[PDB]
Design a protein around this ligand. Structure first.
Ligand SMILES: CN1CC[C@@H](C(=O)Nc2cncc3ccccc23)c2cc(Cl)ccc21
Ligand SMILES: CN1CC[C@@H](C(=O)Nc2cncc3ccccc23)c2cc(Cl)ccc21
Lengths: 304, 304
């Protein structure tokens, strides 16, 4: 019993974190095999971030300008290349702690753990989600760039995010491990506003199923709805539309609780229309949307 | 920017987790040096939990009845002893991954990270606090016993909690690493109700300071209060009394923001009396109390 914002154990990812320095800029890198992945803005000064031409700025850098430090020992850089917004630094030593890994590009609504790092050293681990406007609501300070987001399936770490920047509104933007940003963001100090941060409906439904499994049942009502009727109310509340794919994804939770997906939708509709009335669900006064249906099943079953 | 429920990196603690089996019971153990620490109820059957005499039940167990498995390799048990509600199993091999460590007993209001484990394998990491009624609101399932709670100061892991049981209300109870339970709980399947779960006032004030540092300032008002006036309102809302020690602990946050501690108290008093009015603070519709003043400073400064 109990439902917590739980992150994956970070050990496998801590063993990959290195410090990358280029001139006066120091950020974090991810060392997998003989390659160190880091944001390409490590080659910039603060003045370059205004209008950086990364191809031109990179010409003025050689292998020896990139200082990679793993623990307190220096790694020899024997090659460097730019792939989209990340630099790949070929080092002469393969990471002895390289776990089994994949590079995946996640969809909005999908959650992942972040190991926030400073100077190649981990400071914390927390769970977050790719927002539908392709930002992440993380907890990052200066020097956090290069910190990664990941998921684990038994012994395979799927890296999905690398942190690049904080937008003027305090929200965060970054890339997958191929250097492609999530959303329309660019690695420049320029006016970039985020779109609407809608609520991930399928995740709220999953957390409502987690609440029923953990004994919070006050919000269960006598009603049902249809996907179209539900989506009319969801649109009005800046909630993502719910599809038959989402209903299918919620099937196992529907089976665990005996509560049909559309009945849970009607319950959610009444919570949107009536409010919580000062009550809480799983120790929260608002509807949580950063737990996917897979996260609820994993947490309630004990996947290790 | 951004404020998250952040847990310490779990790597150092994952390297200590082992599986302990006694007869038909399997739980987790913490392997530090040549000692494995685990809940003493590993020697019980489900029927023994009703009225267990641990000294008598332990007589019927020898070193070879305790099966310690680290990874997929068996550890040889060369000694066993009971210390309060934990068993200490002396093994013939010292944990090669033993980090620098301390065993500390924390006070209510203090927070710690939990690495939830099943069969000696980690499943997740989350942050929680020792409630003022000495329970913890964790996320634990059957077999989670022996999972530990800890804090890290650079390279030293201070172990403070070991999970033992879930109370009938879904809340959790456990011991420090000397086997002494937090609160009045006992390791028996018996009616044990928790006391009042009051809000940790000094932690709410710390999180209100975190909100001001991260740009959420709507709740800042034109008032001030005194410790006595504030505590009259705090008592009425089931909030812990605020002491001059708490005011002192909040000093660095008071300095960072330029907002006197008693001004923040007046702001908190108005939030208690008026409510949030549908607004949020750091993405929360309720006042968060599981971030200590030290956690806010650490997260906002980037301690690694
Ligand atoms: C102007 N600037 C600053 C350095 C770096 C940046 O955003 N770093 C940071 C990341 N996350 C939180 C922060 C919190 C305070 C300070 C920096 C933070 C960056 C990166 C890009 Cl791609 C563009 C601009 C830019
Ligand atoms: C009756 N019983 C069950 C096994 C064990 C116990 O509480 N285990 C569990 C711990 N945390 C969550 C759980 C969730 C579902 C099931 C067990 C859970 C235990 C331990 C003590 Cl000290 C006393 C009684 C008792």
């Amino acid at each position: 019993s109990g439902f917590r914002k739980m992150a994956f154990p970070s050990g496998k990812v801590e063993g990959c974190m290195v410090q990358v320095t280029c001139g006066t800029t120091t950020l974090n890198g991810l060392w997998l095999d003989d390659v160190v992945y880091c944001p390409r803005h490590v080659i910039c000064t603060s003045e370059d971030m205004l209008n950086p031409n990364y191809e031109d700025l990179l010409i003025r850098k050689s292998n020896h300008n990139f200082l990679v430090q793993a623990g307190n020992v220096q790694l020899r850089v024997i090659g460097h290349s730019m792939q989209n917004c990340v630099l790949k630094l070929k080092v002469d030593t393969a990471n002895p702690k390289t776990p089994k890994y994949k590079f995946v590009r996640i969809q909005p609504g999908q959650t992942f753990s972040v190991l926030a790092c400073y100077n190649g050293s981990p400071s914390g681990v927390y769970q977050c989600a790719m927002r539908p406007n392709f930002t992440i609501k993380g907890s990052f300070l200066n020097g956090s760039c290069g910190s990664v987001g990941f998921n684990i399936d038994y012994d395979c770490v799927s890296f999905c995010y690398m942190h690049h920047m904080e937008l003027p509104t305090g929200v965060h933007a970054g890339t997958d491990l191929e250097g492609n940003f999530y959303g329309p963001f660019v690695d420049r100090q320029t006016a970039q506003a985020a779109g609407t941060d809608t609520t991930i409906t399928v995740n709220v439904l999953a957390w409502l199923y987690a609440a029923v499994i953990n004994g919070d049942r006050w919000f269960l009502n006598r009603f049902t709805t249809t996907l179209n009727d539900f989506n009319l109310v969801a649109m009005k509340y800046n909630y993502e539309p719910l599809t038959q794919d989402h209903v299918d994804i919620l099937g196992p939770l529907s089976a665990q609780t005996g509560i049909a997906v559309l009945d849970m939708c009607a319950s959610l509709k009444e919570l949107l229309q009536n409010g919580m009335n000062g009550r809480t669900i799983l120790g929260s006064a608002l509807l949580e949307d950063e737990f996917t249906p897979f996260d609820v099943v994993r947490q309630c079953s004990g996947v290790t």
